[PDB]
Design a protein around this nucleic acid. Structure first.
Length: 303
DNA sequence: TTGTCTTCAACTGCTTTCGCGATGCATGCATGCATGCATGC
C-alpha cells in the first residue's frame, strides 16, 4: 500500500497512455479549433510548465482575470463527438481491458485498481512485502530488522536506489557496526553527480540541474559533523568546487561554513567572507529572515 | 627649352665550423534512455 521503488512496468500501461494522450490531443485540438506514438505523448505532455527558513511560494497578485461559461452540454458534446470516433480506430487494435479502460476514463470515471495493484506475480508480490516490512520496521524504530530488510532489498536485482533516506536515517540510528550516514550520503553524491523520460526525480536525479537528496543532505550533515566540534575548510574547499553555482542554497551552506569558522584578522577575513556569500546567495533562493539576524550575529562577532 | 651631373632616396644582398632536436568547422560515430518491433511459446 506504499509506492514501490522499482521501475513501474513494461506492460499495457504504455498503450493506455497512448489512447489517453492521443484522445486528449484530438479533443484539445478541436477545442482550439472552436475557440478560433511515444512522441505524440511527448509533445502532448510537453507544452506545459514542466520566522523560519521557508522556500516561500509564488503568490497571487500580478496574475490573471476571470472567465465566464465556456461549456454547455449541447456544446461540449460538439467537441466530444468526433475525436471519440477517431479513437474508435486504434481502440480497435488495443486490448479489451484497455478498450474498457479508455471507455471509462473518457466517460470521466477513474480506475480503482492501481498500476501496482494490477501488475501481477510471485516475485513482485514478494518484493512488495519485503519493502513494506522495511517501511514498517523503520516506522517502528526497529533499526536492526529494518537494516536486514534494506540489505535483502537492495540485494534484489530490481530495486533502484530510490530508497536512500531509507539508509540515510536507517544506518543513521545504527551506530552499531557499519560505515554509515555520511558514508552513504557522500557516496550517493560522488556516484550520481555526472553522466558516468519518466520513472524519476525530485529525490533522485542526475546532473545539469539540481539534485535535492544526496547533495544538500551530505552538504549540511557534514556541517552538523562540525557542530560535533564545538573539517570546515575541507567542507568549504569541496563545497568550493562548484559549479552548478546556481545552487543558491549551497551558497547559504557556504556562508554557514564561514559563520562556523568564525565561531585575528584571519577571523576578520572569515566574517568578510560570510558577508560576501550571503548576498551572492541573494542570487535568489530566499533564506534567513533578516540577514540582519545573521548580521547581528556577525556583530556579536565584530566585538 | 633643354641639356645632365646634380642630389636625395626606394630596393636589396649577406652573417665562423659541426653533431643532438596549421587553424577552423562540418560530419558522424559514441553514449544513454525510451519507444517499437521481431522472435518464441
Amino acid at each position: 500500500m506504499f509506492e514501490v521503488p522499482i521501475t513501474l512496468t513494461n506492460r499495457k500501461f504504455a498503450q493506455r497512455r497512448k489512447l489517453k494522450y492521443q484522445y486528449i490531443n484530438y479533443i484539445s485540438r478541436r477545442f482550439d479549433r472552436i475557440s478560433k506514438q511515444q512522441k505524440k505523448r511527448r509533445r502532448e505532455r510537453h507544452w506545459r510548465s514542466v520566522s523560519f527558513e521557508i522556500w516561500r511560494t509564488v503568490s497571487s497578485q500580478n496574475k490573471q482575470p476571470i472567465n465566464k461559461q465556456k461549456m454547455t452540454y449541447h456544446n461540449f458534446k460538439k467537441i466530444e463527438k468526433i475525436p471519440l470516433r477517431k479513437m474508435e480506430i486504434p481502440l480497435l487494435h488495443c486490448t479489451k481491458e484497455n478498450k474498457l479502460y479508455f471507455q471509462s476514463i473518457s466517460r470521466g470515471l477513474e480506475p480503482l485498481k492501481t498500476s501496482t495493484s494490477e501488475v501481477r506475480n510471485y516475485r513482485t508480490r514478494h518484493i512488495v512485502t519485503l519493502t513494506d516490512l522495511l517501511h514498517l520496521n523503520v516506522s517502528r524504530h526497529n533499526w536492526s530488522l529494518a537494516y536486514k530488510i534494506f540489505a535483502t532489498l537492495i540485494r534484489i536485482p530490481g530495486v533502484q536506489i530510490k530508497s536512500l533516506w531509507g539508509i540515510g536515517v536507517e544506518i543513521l540510528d545504527n551506530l552499531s557496526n557499519s560505515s554509515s550516514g555520511l558514508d552513504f550520503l557522500q557516496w550517493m553524491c560522488q556516484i550520481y553527480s555526472s553522466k558516468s523520460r519518466s520513472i524519476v526525480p525530485p529525490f533522485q536525479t542526475g546532473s545539469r540541474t539540481h539534485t535535492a537528496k544526496f547533495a544538500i543532505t551530505y552538504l549540511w550533515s557534514s556541517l552538523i559533523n562540525c557542530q560535533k566540534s564545538m573539517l570546515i575548510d575541507k567542507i568549504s574547499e569541496w563545497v568550493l568546487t562548484p559549479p552548478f553555482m546556481e545552487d543558491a542554497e549551497v551558497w547559504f551552506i557556504y556562508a554557514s561554513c564561514h559563520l562556523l569558522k568564525a565561531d585575528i584578522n584571519q577571523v576578520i577575513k572569515h566574517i568578510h567572507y560570510v558577508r560576501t556569500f550571503l548576498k551572492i546567495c541573494l542570487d535568489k533562493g530566499g533564506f534567513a529572515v533578516p540577514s540582519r539576524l545573521i548580521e547581528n550575529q556577525l556583530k556579536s562577532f565584530e566585538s
